């Protein structure tokens, strides 16, 4: 069970950012669930193994390469030089992302999301997940810093004893 | 536009193409307005000229999901093809295949662009008698005549050198090294020896690789002179 939250700039209104959370069990190959939000209303959708396999077959692409490209585009895996452009038609509830390639654009994925009646629940769940992960990271950092300080003190003591021994 | 593409194709050198155990000789000229292609296999010559509308339609039909202006498509095709044609043994990224229709030829090219598939298809009809003649026969004719003139000039130079060697031998000292002696040159004897011995291998066309590898500069010069 893993989930990643990313920020995106929809071309329709490139002034206010949106947040997309994608969660998967083991890898994106089997499938995942995606949820787009902007702070007021949210949409949700799911992609299964059959859907991703069909999309890859339509692309005449290797499954591994397609999975890697999807991971790069959705999990904010921006490379040294690569731009991905996303857009979500609200009227048709159709969200699709393409790989802009310097005046030649290659559409990468497209799905139809359903407007969830309750956006408050999903926003609250996202906030709760963020708070949990930040607390866990803070605890891990504190523990690691304490361990590093203790190890540094021990190393200093051992170095001093070694200097004394070599002198004697 | 049309004349520009025709002239660009005419003033281009032949390149070697290897695809699925088959070999071809290809001339390509790309431009923002369209492209011209002339392929051959030493038995038949196919020519295809495509403008903006046709390239756009074919790209949309083949690449269902590649929206781009036709000029960008032409530029990408040029960037993909020209380096491969210019130099062989290039990093293998452009795969080619040829399907011989009863009348036409379908050349399918599949390549990678930033890790994404890129397909294109050349639908080449049989080259017109005038185009094939102007592109192969007359230029080859000029190269043959130019090489004959070169051989004649080299024979004259050999005659001068042989005369001067005779002058040295008539009044001169012995050779420091005797292994450097050379017999007098005879045009008839040399021609007969070459024809009898090395013509079978010298004239072996094979699949066309030696022609592109050896004397493309002479072909380009002859074609450029013919243009003027």
From Swiss-Prot, chain A:
<feature type="region of interest" description="Interaction with IFFO1">
    <location>
        <begin position="1"/>
        <end position="168"/>
    </location>
</feature>
<dbReference type="GO" id="GO:0033152">
    <property type="term" value="P:immunoglobulin V(D)J recombination"/>
</dbReference>
<dbReference type="GO" id="GO:1990166">
    <property type="term" value="P:protein localization to site of double-strand break"/>
</dbReference>
<keyword id="KW-0597">Phosphoprotein</keyword>
<keyword id="KW-0158">Chromosome</keyword>
<feature type="modified residue" description="Phosphoserine; by PRKDC">
    <location>
        <position position="53"/>
    </location>
</feature>
<keyword id="KW-0175">Coiled coil</keyword>
<keyword id="KW-0238">DNA-binding</keyword>
<dbReference type="GO" id="GO:0005958">
    <property type="term" value="C:DNA-dependent protein kinase-DNA ligase 4 complex"/>
</dbReference>
<dbReference type="GO" id="GO:0003677">
    <property type="term" value="F:DNA binding"/>
</dbReference>
<dbReference type="GO" id="GO:0005654">
    <property type="term" value="C:nucleoplasm"/>
</dbReference>
<dbReference type="GO" id="GO:0019899">
    <property type="term" value="F:enzyme binding"/>
</dbReference>
<dbReference type="GO" id="GO:0032807">
    <property type="term" value="C:DNA ligase IV complex"/>
</dbReference>
<keyword id="KW-0242">Dwarfism</keyword>
<keyword id="KW-0227">DNA damage</keyword>
<dbReference type="GO" id="GO:0070975">
    <property type="term" value="F:FHA domain binding"/>
</dbReference>
<keyword id="KW-0832">Ubl conjugation</keyword>
<keyword id="KW-0233">DNA recombination</keyword>
<dbReference type="GO" id="GO:0006284">
    <property type="term" value="P:base-excision repair"/>
</dbReference>
<keyword id="KW-0234">DNA repair</keyword>
<dbReference type="GO" id="GO:0042802">
    <property type="term" value="F:identical protein binding"/>
</dbReference>
<comment type="similarity">
    <text>Belongs to the XRCC4-XLF family. XRCC4 subfamily.</text>
</comment>
From Swiss-Prot, chain B:
<dbReference type="GO" id="GO:0001650">
    <property type="term" value="C:fibrillar center"/>
</dbReference>
<dbReference type="GO" id="GO:0006303">
    <property type="term" value="P:double-strand break repair via nonhomologous end joining"/>
</dbReference>
<dbReference type="GO" id="GO:0033152">
    <property type="term" value="P:immunoglobulin V(D)J recombination"/>
</dbReference>
<dbReference type="GO" id="GO:0005654">
    <property type="term" value="C:nucleoplasm"/>
</dbReference>
<comment type="subunit">
    <text>Homodimer; mainly exists as a homodimer when not associated with XRCC4. Interacts with XRCC4; the interaction is direct and is mediated via a head-to-head interaction between N-terminal head regions. Component of the core long-range non-homologous end joining (NHEJ) complex (also named DNA-PK complex) composed of PRKDC, LIG4, XRCC4, XRCC6/Ku70, XRCC5/Ku86 and NHEJ1/XLF. Additional component of the NHEJ complex includes PAXX.</text>
</comment>
<keyword id="KW-0539">Nucleus</keyword>
<feature type="coiled-coil region">
    <location>
        <begin position="129"/>
        <end position="171"/>
    </location>
</feature>
<keyword id="KW-0158">Chromosome</keyword>
<dbReference type="GO" id="GO:0035861">
    <property type="term" value="C:site of double-strand break"/>
</dbReference>
<dbReference type="GO" id="GO:0030183">
    <property type="term" value="P:B cell differentiation"/>
</dbReference>
<keyword id="KW-0227">DNA damage</keyword>
<dbReference type="GO" id="GO:0051351">
    <property type="term" value="P:positive regulation of ligase activity"/>
</dbReference>
<keyword id="KW-0225">Disease variant</keyword>
<keyword id="KW-0175">Coiled coil</keyword>
<keyword id="KW-0234">DNA repair</keyword>
<comment type="function">
    <text>DNA repair protein involved in DNA non-homologous end joining (NHEJ); it is required for double-strand break (DSB) repair and V(D)J recombination and is also involved in telomere maintenance. Plays a key role in NHEJ by promoting the ligation of various mismatched and non-cohesive ends. Together with PAXX, collaborates with DNA polymerase lambda (POLL) to promote joining of non-cohesive DNA ends. May act in concert with XRCC5-XRCC6 (Ku) to stimulate XRCC4-mediated joining of blunt ends and several types of mismatched ends that are non-complementary or partially complementary.</text>
</comment>
<dbReference type="GO" id="GO:0010212">
    <property type="term" value="P:response to ionizing radiation"/>
</dbReference>
<feature type="site" description="Leu-lock">
    <location>
        <position position="116"/>
    </location>
</feature>
<keyword id="KW-0705">SCID</keyword>
<keyword id="KW-0238">DNA-binding</keyword>
<dbReference type="GO" id="GO:0007417">
    <property type="term" value="P:central nervous system development"/>
</dbReference>
<dbReference type="GO" id="GO:0005634">
    <property type="term" value="C:nucleus"/>
</dbReference>
């Amino acid at each position: 069970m893993e989930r990643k939250i990313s920020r995106i700039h929809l071309v329709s209104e490139p002034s206010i950012t949106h947040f997309l959370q994608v969660s998967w069990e083991k890898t994106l190959e089997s499938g995942f669930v995606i949820t787009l939000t902007d702070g007021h209303s949210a949409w949700t959708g799911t992609v299964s193994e059959s859907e991703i396999s069909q999309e890859a077959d339509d692309m005449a692409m290797e499954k591994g390469k397609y999975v890697g490209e999807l991971r790069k585009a959705l999990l904010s895996g921006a490379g040294p030089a690569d731009v991905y452009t996303f857009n979500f038609s609200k009227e048709s509830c159709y969200f699709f992302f393409e790989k802009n390639l310097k005046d030649v654009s290659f559409r990468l994925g497209s799905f139809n999301l359903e407007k969830v009646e309750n956006p408050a629940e999903v926003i609250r769940e996202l906030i709760c997940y963020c708070l949990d992960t930040i607390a866990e990271n803070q605890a891990k950092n504190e523990h690691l810093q304490k361990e590093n300080e203790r190890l540094l003190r021990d190393w200093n003591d051992v170095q001093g004893r070694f200097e004394k021994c070599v002198s004697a | 536009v049309m004349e520009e593409l025709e002239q660009g194709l005419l003033m281009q050198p032949w390149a070697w193409l290897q695809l699925a155990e088959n070999s071809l000789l290809a001339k390509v000229f790309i431009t923002k307005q369209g492209y011209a292609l002339l392929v051959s296999d030493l038995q038949q010559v196919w020519h295809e000229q495509v403008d903006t509308s046709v390239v756009s339609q074919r790209a949309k039909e083949l690449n269902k999901r590649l929206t781009a202006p036709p000029a960008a498509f032409l530029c990408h095709l040029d960037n993909l093809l020209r380096p491969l044609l210019k130099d062989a043994a290039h990093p293998s990224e452009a795969t080619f295949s040829c399907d011989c229709v009863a009348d036409a030829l379908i050349l399918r090219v599949r390549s990678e662009l930033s890790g994404l598939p890129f397909y294109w298809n050349f639908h080449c009809m049989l080259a017109s008698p005038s185009l094939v003649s102007q592109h192969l026969i007359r230029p080859l004719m000029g190269m043959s005549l130019a090489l004959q003139c070169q051989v004649r000039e080299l024979a004259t130079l050999l005659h001068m050198k042989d005369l001067e060697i005779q002058d040295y031998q008539e009044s001169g000292a012995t050779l420091i090294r005797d292994r450097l002696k050379t017999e007098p040159f005879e045009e008839n004897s040399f021609l007969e020896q070459f024809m009898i011995e090395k013509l079978p291998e010298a004239c072996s066309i094979g699949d066309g690789k030696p022609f592109v590898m050896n004397l493309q500069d002479l072909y380009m010069a002859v074609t450029t002179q013919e243009v003027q």
